[PDB]
Design a protein around this ligand. Sequence first.
Ligand SMILES: Cc1nnc2c3ccccc3c(N[C@@H](C)[C@H](c3ccccc3)N(C)C)nn12
Ligand SMILES: [Cl-]
Length: 106
Amino acid sequence: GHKEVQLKDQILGVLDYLEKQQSAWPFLKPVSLSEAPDYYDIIKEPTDILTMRRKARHGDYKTKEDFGIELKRMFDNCRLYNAPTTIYFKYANELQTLIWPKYEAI
Ligand SMILES: Cc1nnc2c3ccccc3c(N[C@@H](C)[C@H](c3ccccc3)N(C)C)nn12
Ligand SMILES: [Cl-]
């Protein structure tokens, strides 16, 4: 109970730092089929910042690694789908590089 509360707050603190970065804005909501019709043929376990924040608020992450797996998957999904010239691919790398020390300190 108390260990989950401490972890929840730390995860939200990392998601707070993540969302105030300029490269975070495209990750604030899920991709739609209108803008990327074959996105969900390629990405089987989609995620985004708001989804992870809801999950964190509700107590869904029992451990730091449970959060880490999905955080990393947000970036990995993005680079799997998008070509290297896209802003999405480029921001996923900038944003992941920025957040990783914060995630590691959890
Ligand atoms: C993130 C991400 N990774 N791949 C994609 C993608 C691929 C092809 C076309 C569009 C996207 C994409 N669209 C973003 C701009 C778009 C958006 C709109 C408003 C606020 C936040 C985000 N989507 C996620 C709804 N966001 N996105
Ligand atoms: Cl809500």
